[PDB]
């Protein structure tokens, strides 16, 4: 017989010494169990490879060994410890007393690896223990450790630690992890990569949505807001690759996500105090017409809202900010809105939002004044007002699309 | 096509073998005779060499080419091997150590162009072939030497130096390998 | 039973699948068909020929596989193509059109991978494959590419692919690779990241001191050793690794390891032709005590003398070349060589090299004048001389010693 649940054992004694990321280390052991039995039935698969079928579903919190033994949550252990003595230990770190540059730097780069390439259920129970305890150290340690080369490793080590869970990424939001970044971004502009990474990154904590306490915007308001425009608008000599820009768009959409209404909004205010947003406004509209979102880099299950339809629903809430667009991209955003809206099926989630963005830009802008698309926006009015079915994501259309016209009796009238 | 092919096969000449045999003017020794005339084939190779090289196509007109295709292979090992020397002292004695190497005969597998000469049937032309394409070789050296060698400094001479890259039809007389 | 098709297969087909490079993917079988049978007693005899057929490598095992070629080859077979097609593309490399460095690169960083994630025994044969027309291919495209950006990634393979094989060397080193490689050192020195790898490896190829063809001395000789000793002195106001005067060191060891005696000798030229001799001739001590060579890295077959004893070899042939020394650097290099003539255990060969170098010490340079050490001089020789050891090296110290004392009386005290 084999050794019943012996499965999990190899998982760890290969990667012990081969170096395998947890994924390809299954993988190859998929593979050395599959080609023996393919190439000698002759005595002992019949049963003893039969068995480590349980490499499937003797597997993730089930799998743990007995005792501690799992070199991911042996490595975690060590090396969060000693980061929490090194954060604490306020005499080095306000003053020199060890040269402590590149021997913390091999464990950030272990701790790089580590997450990532582990067992994604070990580390998520690491992160997860005491209440996020290890979080708020790294979060810390970053606060305090400000030497760039140290920096960079541990901006990454956020973008790891983002992906395993969505309750993580709530702890880092309410942390107050993002005030600092946004602090260095608005104070340095000559570290091209860390740049990068600090508006990558911040994108990322927010990309959930959920709301901050009523202290984050000290720093992550308006006057933040306005230097990301800029950036868009004539960026800074390092951009070489052309990177800045969306990354920072990418970032006011995340940021615009979880704010509530039309006067509150510090992003729709930035808007409107700025010159002049040509670049801007042209990239959005890209984003609109393939109708992705940026903002849903991580996978999470509650999606929020569709990022852009969002913040276009915000930018027409008034008047003041619908000037922003050129009248030629203005004629564009009708002609991609009323395509979107005939090609959807009834009944599709995001068929209540486009109908809102129209609703949005016939009250503040001056749409009934030049009709681009109205005798064939009428047209379909006219038959989703009259489309027979019952799912509630089509009750609310058909609401939506009453009140579009009786607010506006032209639109549903007659086309002529 | 205006390849320089061999112009001494006059018929009068013996003809042992599956290549011209040719009276190779020589101290050193071996089946053929000596010719007393100004000129014979191991001066025609070397006489034509820096022409034929460049010549990417290369009939057989008359059995004396396909001796003249293997003169010109060992001169360019001659090259291959004389570009190395220190002086001309060396380049004639590290020449005679070349000469009696055992290179593949025409019939021997590895020599490159066992398609085009056919094999040595018996002793009495193995043997001829053996005692023959030395004396070819153990000559072609000791006239390289003589002007590869440029007279002020010993130097092998930078223009015939420029030829080591070049092979003849890109054939190699290191066959499959030395 | 299992088939000797395990043998070789199973390491095939783990490779092609994980990318886990060739001796851990040989750990990587090792563990897990020996865990299991160390696990399940009932069914190991079954695995326990597993191992075994993998335990005596390749040598017929992997014959064949399966009547395959191995992936890796599949590739080089590939790669070594399409960079040659690329030269001789007479139009497209001197009068360009497409963006063909964005695609190039990709191969080069492949072949740079395979050729040490593979099993050596294949690229091997791949570099020998058709009288080394694959290492040609690369040799000719790294002189006919101005890009930079390539060129070190071109170094890179030269660097794995001398380490393959000494066959390889004696390619490269006949060939046209270290006179291109003079000219950009000379010339580019501004691109300080390259320069480090231009050095590194034109040191690599020389390491094994084969004869070289004269038309190199055109320019490996006497004006680029001087180049090279105003790097070790001076460093450069660029070097913000400050590593080149190390590999300096290294290139000027590697290129004197081939010259013959100390006559004609181009780098001894160099050293005789300046006054610019100081950290040079100092930091040779610190290799000297250091008893060990950087060159013969790679430790092919037959082996190379020891390069820095050779080199002082050299530097002591001559008088002009023996002056390079200040007098406190000479009484180190003294003390620094009886040190290991006292310490070498008998009979091998350093013993007679080190022996060599104060023998050349003596009769070089003013010693008999202040003696220093000469006492214990007396006492070494006279221990050797009196030594019970024989041997074939042990036997020829005897001679050298006592043709030495003969030379020198005062060696021995009469």
């Given at each position: 017989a084999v050794p019943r649940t012996i499965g999990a054992e190899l998982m760890e004694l290969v990667r012990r010494?081969?170096?395998?990321?947890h994924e390809l280390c299954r993988v190859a052991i998929g593979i050395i169990v599959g080609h023996i039995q393919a190439s000698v039935?002759?005595?002992?698969?019949?049963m003893e490879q039969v068995l480590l079928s349980l490499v499937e579903g003797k597997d993730l919190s089930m799998a743990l060994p007995s005792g501690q033994v799992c070199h991911d949550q042996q490595r975690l252990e060590v090396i969060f410890a000693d980061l929490a003595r090194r954060k604490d230990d306020a005499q080095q770190r306000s003053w020199a007393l060890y040269e402590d540059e590149g021997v913390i730097r091999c464990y950030l780069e272990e701790l790089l690896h580590i997450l990532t390439d582990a067992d994604p259920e070990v580390c998520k129970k690491m992160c997860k223990r005491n209440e996020f305890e290890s979080v708020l150290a790294l979060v810390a340690y970053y606060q305090m450790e400000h030497r760039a080369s140290l920096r960079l490793l541990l901006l990454k080590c956020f973008g790891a630690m983002c992906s395993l869970d969505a309750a993580i990424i709530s702890t880092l939001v309410s942390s107050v992890l993002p005030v600092e970044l946004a602090r260095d971004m608005q104070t340095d502009t000559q570290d091209h990569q860390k740049l990068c990474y600090s508006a990558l990154i911040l994108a990322m904590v927010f990309s959930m949505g959920e709301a901050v306490p009523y202290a984050h915007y000290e720093h992550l308001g308006t006057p933040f807001a306005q230097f990301l425009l800029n950036i868009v608008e004539d960026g800074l000599p390092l951009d070489t690759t052309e990177q800045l820009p969306d990354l920072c768009v990418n970032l006011l959409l995340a940021l615009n996500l979880h704010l509530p209404a039309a006067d509150q909004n510090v992003i729709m205010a930035a808007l409107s105090k700025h010159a002049n947003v040509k670049i801007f406004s042209e990239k959005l509209l890209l984003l609109l017409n393939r109708?992705?979102?940026?903002?849903?880099i991580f996978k999470h299950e509650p999606q929020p809202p569709h990022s852009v339809l969002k913040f276009l629903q915000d930018v027409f809430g008034s008047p003041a900010t619908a000037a922003i667009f050129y009248h030629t991209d203005m004629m564009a955003l009708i002609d991609i809105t009323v395509r979107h809206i005939a090609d959807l099926s009834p009944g599709d989630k995001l068929r209540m939002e486009y109908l809102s963005l129209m609703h949005a830009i016939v009250r503040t802008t001056p749409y009934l004044q030049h009709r681009h698309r109205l005798p064939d926006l009428q047209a379909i009015l006219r038959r989703i007002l009259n489309e027979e079915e019952t799912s509630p994501q089509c009750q609310m259309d058909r609401m939506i699309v009453r009140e579009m016209c009786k607010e506006f009796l032209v639109l549903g009238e007659a086309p002529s | 096509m205006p390849a320089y092919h061999s112009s001494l096969m006059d018929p009068d000449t013996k003809l042992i073998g599956n290549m011209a045999l040719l009276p190779i003017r020589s101290q050193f020794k071996g089946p053929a005779p000596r010719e007393t005339?100004?000129?014979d084939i191991v001066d025609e190779a070397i006489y034509y060499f820096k022409a034929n090289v460049f010549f990417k196509n290369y009939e057989i007109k008359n059995e004396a080419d396909r001796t003249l295709i293997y003169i010109t292979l060992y001169i360019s090992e001659c090259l291959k091997k004389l570009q190395?020397?220190?002086s001309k002292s060396q380049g004639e004695k590290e020449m005679y150590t070349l000469g009696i190497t055992n290179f593949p005969i025409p019939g021997e597998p590895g020599f490159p162009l066992n398609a085009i000469y056919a094999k040595p049937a018996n002793k009495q032309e193995d043997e001829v072939m053996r005692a023959y394409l030395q004396q070819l070789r153990q000559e072609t050296g000791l006239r390289l030497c003589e002007k590869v060698?440029?007279?002020?400094?010993?130097?092998?001479?930078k223009w015939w130096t420029c030829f080591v890259k070049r092979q003849f039809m890109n054939k190699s007389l290191s066959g499959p390998g030395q």
């Open positions: 010494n081969t170096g395998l990321s039935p002759a005595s002992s698969p019949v109708g992705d979102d940026p903002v849903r | 005339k100004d000129t190395k020397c220190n060698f440029d007279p002020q400094n010993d130097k092998p001479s």
